[PDB]
């Protein structure tokens with residue numbers, strides 16, 4: 001077993017909790033924490049800003065070196081970097097930002113990256129400041145990810161709505 005606790009099971013492989021992913025990561029120290037990244041790995045706000053702050057900006061320093069070497073990610077893409085003090089690894093995943101004119105169909109591709117990892121602690125991709133409907137996103141997650149995913153949803157009101165209206 002592992003050190004996750006307090007999660008509501010949604011399917012064979014998807015679990016969910018009303019929690020801050022940053023606090024969940026510090027407590028569990030999972031193998032993989034997912035960051036809700038942008039293509040530039042500029043971790044300004046939301047999950048990305050909060051994770052980076054918890055690493056004392058080390059995530060940003062590492063990310064800037066990654067971009068200087070490799071260039072930007074693709075929308076729907078990902079890269080594996082250090083988890084710093086929060087996890088062994090951080091999987092930086094770019095969901096489409098609907099406010100940036102990006103294809104919502106790329107959300108499925110974004111979640112497909114989770115399948116390369118047996119277990120992950122993750123946020124809902126493209127939710128929050130990325131502008132997509134979190135209910136939709138949960139549906140895409142459940143219908144796309146086959147590995148074991150532990151979702152942290154920080155917003156209590158949304159968690160209650162997602163968990164109660166989940167099909």
Ligand SMILES: O=C1CC[C@@H](c2ccccc2)N1Nc1ncnc2[nH]c(Cl)cc12
Nearest residue numbers: 020021050127128129130152153154155
């Ligand atoms: O709860 C949700 C639902 C989707 C996403 C979101 C994206 C864009 C705008 C609002 C919300 N989100 N944020 C977080 N999820 C987990 N841990 C977190 N920690 C901190 Cl800080 C924030 C945070």
